[PDB]
């Protein structure tokens, strides 16, 4: 009668407590995945069932709020979210998804539609920052958790939500498809410190799509094409194969085979 739901707090939030948060995150959203290749493919959009569709992620902070973002598990990303009474969702792509989203918080009073995707250039505009220069760690995501509830109630601006939009899908959409950005976080939370991803960061979530594809059309392992991905310190490289992402990209968007 519910989805999936997974908890995490940032009140007293330690390296372990994040880790078991995000593959808990990843072993709900690869329940129907393919893991029969190198890196699990998460199901097909196409021909799944409405209740096997969705999962739920469950936040609260130190003030002891709380908000439920939903995760789609063909492409883990957010469509939408929970405060109280109400539930806001991003402008789906088609009616077919539109369809799909009405099975979610069906409970609620207020169902509000955003004008607006949640893709990070639209982000980024709405917010009025890049992800360059907004910070990630424990003490975002607490104040991310704040304003995401209080959007429900009047008291925070769109530019806020927008900005709190990209540290929370950062922080767990992308840490769940990437091995990589989730030990960027684990770094933050250890240390106790808040800062900006650098370029490495950027460019895996920009292309997480494109890697997708080059993986699931690889022959042999091997690439058609290079994709080219860049180091923290900016400067680009280019992959040719398979096996070197094994431990940098822990799920995929389903990809066709020729
Ligand atoms: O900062 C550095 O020295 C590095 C940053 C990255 C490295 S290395 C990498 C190597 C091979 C891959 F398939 C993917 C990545 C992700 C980004």
Redesign the pocket.
């Known amino acids: 009668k519910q989805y999936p739901i997974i908890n995490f707090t940032t009140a007293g939030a330690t390296v372990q407590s994040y880790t078991n948060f995000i593959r808990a995150v990843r072993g709900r959203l690869t329940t129907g995945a393919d893991v029969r290749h190198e890196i699990p493919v998460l199901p097909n959009r196409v021909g799944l069932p409405i209740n096997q569709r969705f999962i739920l992620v469950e936040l609260s902070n130190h003030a002891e709020l709380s908000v439920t973002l939903a995760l789609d598990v063909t492409n883990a990303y957010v469509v939408g979210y929970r405060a109280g009474n109400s539930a806001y969702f991003f402008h789906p792509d088609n009616q077919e998804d539109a369809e799909a989203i009405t099975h979610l918080f069906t409970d609620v009073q207020n169902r509000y539609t955003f004008a607006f995707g949640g893709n990070y250039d639209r982000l980024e505009q709405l917010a009025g920052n890049l992800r360059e220069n907004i910070e990630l760690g424990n003490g975002p995501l607490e104040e991310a958790i704040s304003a995401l509830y209080y959007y429900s109630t009047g008291g925070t601006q769109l530019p806020t939500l927008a900005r709190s939009f990209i540290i929370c899908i950062q922080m767990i959409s992308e840490a769940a498809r990437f091995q990589?950005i989730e030990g960027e976080m684990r770094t933050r939370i250890r240390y106790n410190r808040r800062s900006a991803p650098?370029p490495?960061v950027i460019?895996?979530e920009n292309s997480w799509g494109r890697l997708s594809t080059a993986i699931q059309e690889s022959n042999q392992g091997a690439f058609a094409s290079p994709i080219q991905?860049?180091?923290?310190?900016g400067s680009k490289?280019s992959?040719y194969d398979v096996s070197?992402?094994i431990?940098?990209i822990a799920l995929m968007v389903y990809r066709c085979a020729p």
């Open positions: 990589y650098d490495s460019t895996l991905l860049q180091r923290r310190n490289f992959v070197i992402l431990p940098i």
